[PDB]
């Protein structure tokens, strides 16, 4: 009964842009990973810090479910020690992440005949993001010596760029929904278990 609502995350009708990575908190519920085991439609399923198998026999203080959307080529980028647009300007991981990562194409859902541009990504930022940092600031980037006084143009760019997702897009360019399931265990009682 007291089962963790992972379904609403993976079966969510809509997702967020990567720069605005959506988060869910999971606590005080039974940890049922069978949905992952049964679900064979996972494009990529890679864990770190702990094996996915001996998890339903293991407790933790809390669980964090990160969700966002990228393209196929950026799937490799969702991991520790990764570099790239998504790695540094839209989402990040520490050098000691403990959890799992899942990715699956959503071209049938996250693409339009006219192109699905609802999902965006940060393309510029004066410094790399800190681990598990979310940035949605609408500040105009200063690319040149001339300050950008809230206006766009020369050396003044909109930080967000919209993805081009269409049914005809390439595999590396078709949309993919990505989830990060992180388990935290501190010197506190664990309210979630298998």
């Amino acid at each position, epitope marked *: 009964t007291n089962l963790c609502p992972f379904g609403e995350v993976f079966n969510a009708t809509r997702f967020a842009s990567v720069y605005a990575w959506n988060r869910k908190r999971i606590s005080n519920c039974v940890a049922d990973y069978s949905v992952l085991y049964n679900s064979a439609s996972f494009s990529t*399923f*890679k*864990c*770190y810090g*702990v*094996s996915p198998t001996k998890l339903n026999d293991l407790c933790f203080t809390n669980v964090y479910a990160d969700s966002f959307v990228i393209r196929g080529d950026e799937v490799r980028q969702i991991a520790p020690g990764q570099t790239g647009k998504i790695a540094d300007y839209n989402y990040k991981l520490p*050098d*000691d992440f403990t959890g799992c990562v899942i990715a699956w194409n959503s071209n049938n859902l996250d693409s339009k005949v006219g192109g699905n541009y609802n999902y965006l990504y940060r393309l510029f930022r004066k410094s790399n993001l800190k681990p598990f940092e979310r940035d949605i600031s609408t500040e105009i980037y200063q690319a040149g010596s001339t300050p950008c006084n809230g206006v766009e143009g020369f050396n003044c760019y909109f930080p967000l760029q919209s993805y081009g997702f269409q049914p005809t897009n390439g595999v590396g360019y078709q949309p993919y929904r990505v989830v990060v399931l992180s388990f935290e265990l501190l010197h506190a009682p664990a309210t979630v278990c298998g």
Partner: antibody
Amino acid sequence: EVQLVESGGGVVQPGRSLRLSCAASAFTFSSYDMHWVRQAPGKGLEWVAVISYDGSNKYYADSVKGRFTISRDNSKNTLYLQMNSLRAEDTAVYYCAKDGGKLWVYYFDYWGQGTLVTVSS
Amino acid sequence: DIQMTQSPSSLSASVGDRVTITCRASQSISSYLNWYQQKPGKAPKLLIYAASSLQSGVPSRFSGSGSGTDFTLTISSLQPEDFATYYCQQSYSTLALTFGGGTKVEIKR
């Protein structure tokens, strides 16, 4: 005192299928996960796939993901390894290995003697 | 992904000498490293797990240390039966495990 017996190894043409058997003894085959490790001639070790203790969770290496199959029968304490549509790259020595379950991270505790598999047209 | 470099590729040592082997990773792992031993022809065998834990039935001369990217395996006093090839394998990547290139130890004659 742990005994493992690989069997079913042999030679076949590329694109065919082969079944390999690991026989468990002197331990609870049902209460530990199993890994398959292959080592090409002259090279070192190469991880392939792993199965849970209960046989409900399955995982494979990217190099063979969607091409191999791992299954087990705890009643018989037997471990089955099916390899469909084999490539020349698959010629190596296979070993079966126990889980150990001593950590949240996988180590390798025991190994069998291994069996040889070759692919050639 | 993750790559493991084991050094030296091969070393010459005699009985009673203290041997040290280094294994390095592309990125950092806390203690997700193992050392295994495999004689020529014989099947692989485990020596050390977690990089800081002696396996049961293994002589005390084998000792493991290091964390993050660099790990060391040290033998206080070499023995004739220890002349084998040692593999260092990372465990941080459960579903994409990778092993070291190997380090074959010969007799220093």
